[PDB]
Symmetry: C3
């Protein structure tokens, strides 16, 4: 029983689901273990949709940091006087500020669309709600939460004309994810500003994580990372975003983040993971696809890919965070201590500890 490990088979909850897609909502990081109390303002959401589909317009009382894992998406935020569409390619991340009206389009003809978004609620710490303008057989419109009179007066129309057209009390769709026509998706898809190299530092438009050189790259893995220091949208939430690939056989060298609580959601592959906290204590767990693991601050952990692996991470409390590795060449903390202290720290000689710490010639990603 690993309180920091959430098995996707019994730790998500499906909000809506039909033949065109499903939306799933992770449970609450502190109802799992109160050790996770400082994540109580966060939730993980997973969205998947078949090709040629639309998530009907809606808003929620929560900041959204959405990241596109695979597929292509049209993200359209509607304002009161304005509108903004965006063409999302894999790797792209975008913030939906709380209570924006927005719909998602999957224009691809044969590929799905998988989005994980980080959700920070406004009203209730950890708990949020989805407001759907649309009138579906699944959900009532929140327009229906008003009275006949208040609707009549507000639309300057009698109630049948506003019922035959807005609410529909057989005429209305089956779900909050429905199919589209190609003539629609053709018309929709032409005005959507897409991600670029010059967006790595924009307060509006979506940025791509991988579009820059990783920070860690070798023949066994690559470590893409954007931090609050480079991107204003992330400075506002104080979160780093990282996508790292781990080739099968290889592993990520045991390390700890200095001050950041990391939320990693496995995207592809399998992996084992070892975490140490306090007399020491090992937190191992066997992660497959769509699972989630969370690493407390300054908690050293190893990620061991037992198949071809890519995960996404969320770094909570990400300002000025430092990754300290414990083995390998570059960015070792144990190889920076004064020699006479290394003598004193472990039962060994300065030369004898200097022997063991220099052996491993490679840094970050080694082979197993």
């Amino acid at each position: 029983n690993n309180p920091f490990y959430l098995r996707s088979s019994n730790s998500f909850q499906t909000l809506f689901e039909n033949q065109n897609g499903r939306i799933r909502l992770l449970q609450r990081f502190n109802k799992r273990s109160p050790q996770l109390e400082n994540l109580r303002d966060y939730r993980i959401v997973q969205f998947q949709s078949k090709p040629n589909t639309i998530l009907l317009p809606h808003h929620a009382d929560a900041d959204f940091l959405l990241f596109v894992l695979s597929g292509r998406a049209i993200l359209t935020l509607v304002n009161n006087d304005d509108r903004d569409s965006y063409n999302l390619h894999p790797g792209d991340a975008q913030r939906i500020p709380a209570g924006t009206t927005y719909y998602l389009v999957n224009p691809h003809d044969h590929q799905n669309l998988k989005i994980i978004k980080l959700a920070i609620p406004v009203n209730k710490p950890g708990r949020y709600d989805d407001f759907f303008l649309s009138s579906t057989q699944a959900q009532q419109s929140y327009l229906q939460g008003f009275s006949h009179n208040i609707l009549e007066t507000s639309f300057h129309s009698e109630f049948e004309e506003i019922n035959r057209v807005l609410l529909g009390e057989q005429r209305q769709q089956e779900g909050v994810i429905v199919e589209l026509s190609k003539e629609q998706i053709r018309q929709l898809s032409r005005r959507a500003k897409s991600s670029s190299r010059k967006t790595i530092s924009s307060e509006d438009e979506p940025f791509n994580l991988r579009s820059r050189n990783p920070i860690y790259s070798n023949n066994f893995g690559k470590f893409f990372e954007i931090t609050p220091e480079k991107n204003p949208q992330l400075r506002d939430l104080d979160i780093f975003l990282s996508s790292v690939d781990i080739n099968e056989g290889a592993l990520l060298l045991p390390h700890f983040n200095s001050k950041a609580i990391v939320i990693l959601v496995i995207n592809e592959g399998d992996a084992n993971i070892e975490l140490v906290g306090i007399e020491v204590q090992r937190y191992r767990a066997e992660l497959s696809e769509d699972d989630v693991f969370v690493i407390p601050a300054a908690y050293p952990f190893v990620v061991n890919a037992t198949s071809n692996l890519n995960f996404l991470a969320f770094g909570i409390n990400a300002e000025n965070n430092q990754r300290n590795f414990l083995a390998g060449e570059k960015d070792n903390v144990v190889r920076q201590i004064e020699r006479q202290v290394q003598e004193l720290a472990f039962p060994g000689s300065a030369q004898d500890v200097e022997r063991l710490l220099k052996k491993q010639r490679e840094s970050y990603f080694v082979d197993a």
Copy 2:
């Protein structure tokens, strides 16, 4: 039983009250219902005084944002080396940082003073204490907490002498709201820096909501707003203030705030409010003077004025908030959704939906 509705008749608790006025303190937002757990650090205080009165020198462990609803006050914040007097007119807001000693004078001869302040306690979340320098039949001077021994040394005098002059253990006032002499009102008034139009963006002196033009305004209402973008003192608290007037029979069209939790205080008039949440849920309540009603972020709501109405709204989590109306013409977000999305959203055409939304030729406030 509306969790978001707080009724004056049974939601307030009187901190002090005599013939000359009374300070009432609204119940904690979170004690009412855990739904409001985010406002736990906020309290609403009502202050009311009779003419030619003064509230004796005190300080709280609590930041104040005080809004003079009716009357005219002469607010004097004292510091350890300075003294500041501010002539406040109805509509004036100012901010009393916490631990600032101050007093409050009603100089008028026939009118009452009706102030409401939003309070942000420092020490214990949602709970502060008032600390009166003065020694009155209703409360000791907090200099009495100390021992006689310490008092003699600190002031360099025998205790009989300091107890005759500061504490008075019949020569003392009845309460903390005392009556005034005209000659003294004559003296205390003449130095008061008055709120201006150059002050709308000043870090000290107060600032008048109504001074600039309304954000919205037709023949059925006026919406006055002021935001952290325009005002330093408000950007600090990250709050917007708004005062809005609805004519008898008119209503504020259905709309929602994006991320701002709005504490509205009904100041004059009578309304019916309708809040919607989630399957939808109507939260209707019928409101009268001094009533309080909290609208969570991203919750749609309509204000129906059943008699000429004016309320005050505190906006919590204000920075970059957006008001999205569901009906009318200007700032309707239903009317910004792409046409092909209106086909698929509501049960009916996009010429049928384009027909309905165009009916109401007005915006913001309309007539019932």
Copy 3:
């Protein structure tokens, strides 16, 4: 039973102890009383070590602000690619960012090293672990929490080798504080960059409190203070620091902090304290060496030095705090009230109250 008084003989808890020093942790501020709930995030640690000792390398899931009470010291912070050593003298203070590995050496040949540090946990509010890199009879290195397989792969080595050198499953030391060879403390002493006059506004380097002129100084007491305004480290924490010596028989005139919660620890000598909260509630207390007294924000309090006293204060939420005195000539709020409001606020004339306030002709510290 005063909820703001943490007696040293039953409010502390030893983390580790041996012949070479010990490390206690002050109990949770809120556990004691729910009144101290806004201190839920802060902890106090006490560090005392013998001459020519070391604290083996380690880190914590906590920010640290460590203050040097007495002794000299070498503090070494090791990064993934850098190492930095600081020479700490009495009255020096440094921030150790969360999860920064570090060790601490006492280079002096007879003097102890008393250090005290305020801690801000990053994972559990008010709760953090130490992670010791070293292998010792008292603790396991947090490398033991990885499997053999994983350990072997990472280092590139048989387990029989990484155990013989790093872990040791007799050859290992007894505690986390060990004694040192004089040539060893010699070699650790010669790169340490020391605190200066150049370092009171340096984001990296330690700063001396007593390095600048006190804010208050007279033949009975000195008052040193560094504020968020003048230091970059105390501004990201939003905290002030103060050392204040009070000669025996003197005292620190009644006063209160406008918005700072103050944690004070007594460094030497004895004081009586009186604190007033609210009808007025005195909270009196006879403090000795090592006790902690908390003053919530805006509560007036006095410190009464029964023996050549000096103490340390951590100011929580210090940005723009004002100190406000009630006796003595300078910084006297009670002297800044208008005359005619002095008439109304106490039983006594303006001539009468003016007379009694002018009597004490000194400021800040006076002879009792």
